Design an enzyme around this catalytic site. Structure first.
Site, PDB file in Angstrom:
ATOM      1  N   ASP A 286       0.850  -1.157   0.000  1.00  0.00           N
ATOM      2  CA  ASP A 286       0.000   0.000   0.000  1.00  0.00           C
ATOM      3  C   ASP A 286       0.910   1.240   0.000  1.00  0.00           C
ATOM      4  O   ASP A 286       2.170   1.178  -0.002  1.00  0.00           O
ATOM      5  CB  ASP A 286      -0.977  -0.054   1.196  1.00  0.00           C
ATOM      6  N   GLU A 492     -11.170   7.003   5.352  1.00  0.00           N
ATOM      7  CA  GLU A 492     -10.748   6.465   6.622  1.00  0.00           C
ATOM      8  C   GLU A 492     -10.396   7.585   7.613  1.00  0.00           C
ATOM      9  O   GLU A 492     -10.769   7.529   8.793  1.00  0.00           O
ATOM     10  CB  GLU A 492      -9.565   5.538   6.410  1.00  0.00           C
TER      11      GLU A 492
END
Length: 603
Positions: A286, A492
């Protein structure tokens, strides 16, 4: 005479990989393992460092309003530099095409995954994969970082909308996105092998491995975890279905499992994903995932590189400080701290995906595909998905009431109201256009207001008021109102309201509207939110999730062209202090259970 086996398209993929690998320098090898952001890429960077991959992060676009051809020319320019290296290894360009090709102006925006879960229709999701691949290839891009197969276990997570369901079985079934994106695998296919059919398809990415949807007050993302039957049972199984469908790549989660960072977790990345599931595509980090192995993040980048590569990651999404990555990794291999066998495995896997997907044969964009971006057939599919995603929660205030829905298209005058009735940005939610979602007319699409106007009889006067007071509604002479409210776009860490209460005015508008005329309330949200007050005010209430660019999906149901068929893919809580609370929990006390949904018949 000057024949080079890896450049021979008739040769088997494994032979081409081995032939190329055996010619490569360490610099060329580490280059393949390096993914950079387009913002730090130049022709000399890409050539001089033998770069393997580029991405656009969220919002990384060549300019505001860029056309499909602009995107194509950008990607081609980068590719031309890569093809001019000694070995001519084409780069692979990745992007978050997670509900359509959503960074791109004029791309079809599909419903987010939570709505797709409500459809219970894996074949619809496959077709969405097909359309999405075409729109990604329209922009010259070959790789989509999708599907997110997170099993979201707490709706307070800012990415819960990117999870098809709290129920991992629905997630497993929606892995059919993969063969949509990539093409269907051959008859005799070996589970774990990467597959992409050719130049009209994209490589996919099952993400984020593993347990990214797991708990901690908002699954919100720093160890979001559990235990061994948490794992193998809730968070893992869909990766096996992904393997069965030849997913090309797997992206690692920022979270931890058992107190080990996934980006350093050799047992799960190497022991389980590669050696037990037999995954033979490539594992990608990521964004600055390796940096975050340490606290603070980035405080020992030498250790980050070592721990992630030894764990088994193949490609690093750096994405900006590529010089440091290449330098540190080269030092490690030069010093014998990372063995060449590990590098050669990573490169083998990267090349395997590239050869398998046809990249060496078609490294450049097809201009004839540009017209696929926002193509009307894709929009018609998005409208079908939006309509199928809607969950009717209430259709009448008492058992004696006439059902409000379907509404008649012919009426003297009707009211459309609410902050979400004419706001394409809100209707789309996060990961749209993109260093977040946004508000308004951010792309080509049809708002709920525009959809109503497109649907109703020409004699029906349609009045828009964003936040009318009670007296305006009472005095208006309206036959009914459609009132749309809900969540603002979020992710998020940005805009994530952990009280799960919609912003005002939202409830106050529904109260003023519904207090004066019979009302259908369309709730736009990424998840269940506190709903009792909205329900109590409303004649009908629809959970429309984040339905994307095709607002006519909403009106198709509201006006009875099709029946409501959506069912909750998540539990609707009575209260936030019950959470987490998922199907199968010990004191399962929902407002609406997983699977609930009223229906209507087409008029």
């Amino acid at each position: 005479a000057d024949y080079v086996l890896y450049k021979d398209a008739t040769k088997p993929v494994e032979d081409r990989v081995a032939d190329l690998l055996g010619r490569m320098t360490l610099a060329e090898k580490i280059g393949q393992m390096t993914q950079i952001e387009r913002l730090v890429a130049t022709p000399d960077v890409l050539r001089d460092n033998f770069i393997g991959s580029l991405l656009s992060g969220g919002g990384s676009v060549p300019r505001k309003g860029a056309t499909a051809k602009e995107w194509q020319d950008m990607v081609d320019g980068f590719q031309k530099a890569c093809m001019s290296t000694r070995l001519g290894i084409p780069m692979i360009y990745g992007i978050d095409a997670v509900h359509g090709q959503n960074n791109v102006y004029g791309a079809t925006i599909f419903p987010h995954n939570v709505g797709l879960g409500a459809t219970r229709d894996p074949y619809l999701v496959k077709r969405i994969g097909e359309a999405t691949a075409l729109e990604v290839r329209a922009t010259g891009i070959q790789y989509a970082f999708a599907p997110c197969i997170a099993v979201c276990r707490d709706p307070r997570w800012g990415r819960c909308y990117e999870s098809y369901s709290e129920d991992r079985r629905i997630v497993q079934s929606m892995t059919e996105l993969i063969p949509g994106l990539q093409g269907d695998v051959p008859k005799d296919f070996t589970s774990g092998m990467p597959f992409v059919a050719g130049k009209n398809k994209v490589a996919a990415c099952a993400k984020h491995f593993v347990g990214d949807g797991g708990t901690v007050d908002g699954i919100n993302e720093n160890n979001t975890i559990i235990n061994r039957e948490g794992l193998m049972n809730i968070h893992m199984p869909a990766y096996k279905n992904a393997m069965d469908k030849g997913v090309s790549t797997v992206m690692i989660s920022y979270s931890s499992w058992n107190g080990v960072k996934m980006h350093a977790n050799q047992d799960l990345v190497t022991g389980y994903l590669k050696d037990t599931l037999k995954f033979k595509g490539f594992v990608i980090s990521d964004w600055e995932g390796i940096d975050r192995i340490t606290t603070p993040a980035g405080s020992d980048y030498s250790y980050s590189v070592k721990a992630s590569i030894l764990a088994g990651l193949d490609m690093i999404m750096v994405p900006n400080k590529y010089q440091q990555f290449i330098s540190i990794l080269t030092g490690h291999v030069n010093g014998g701290v990372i063995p060449m066998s590990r590098i050669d495995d990573a490169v083998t896997r990267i090349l395997r995906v590239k050869f398998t997907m046809g990249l060496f044969e078609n490294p450049y964009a097809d201009p004839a595909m540009a017209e696929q971006l926002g193509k009307q057939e894709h929009r018609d599919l998005a409208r079908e998905a939006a309509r199928k995603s809607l969950v009717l929660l209430k259709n009448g205030k008492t058992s004696t009431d006439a059902p409000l829905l379907p509404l008649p298209k012919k009426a003297p005058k009707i009211l459309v109201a609410g902050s979400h009735a004419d706001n394409l940005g809100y209707q789309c939610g996060g990961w749209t256009i993109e260093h977040q979602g946004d508000t308004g007319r951010t792309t080509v699409g049809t708002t709920i207001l525009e959809a109503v106007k497109a649907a109703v009889d020409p004699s029906t006067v349609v009045v828009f008021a964003e936040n009318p007071d009670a007296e305006f509604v009472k005095s208006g002479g309206f036959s009914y109102a459609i009132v749309a409210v809900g969540e603002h776009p979020y992710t998020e860490t940005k805009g994530d309201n952990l009280n799960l209460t919609i912003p005002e005015p939202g409830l106050s508008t529904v109260q003023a509207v519904c207090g004066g005329v019979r009302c259908a309330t369309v709730l736009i949200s990424g998840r269940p939110v506190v709903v009792q007050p909205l329900l109590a005010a409303s004649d009908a209430l629809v959970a429309a999730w984040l339905p994307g660019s095709e607002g006519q999906g909403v009106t198709d149901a509201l006006f009875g062209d099709f029946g409501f068929t959506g069912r909750l893919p998540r539990t609707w809580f009575k209260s936030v202090d019950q959470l987490p609370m998922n199907v199968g929990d010990a004191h399962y006390d929902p407002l609406f259970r997983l699977g609930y949904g009223l229906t209507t018949n087409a008029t």
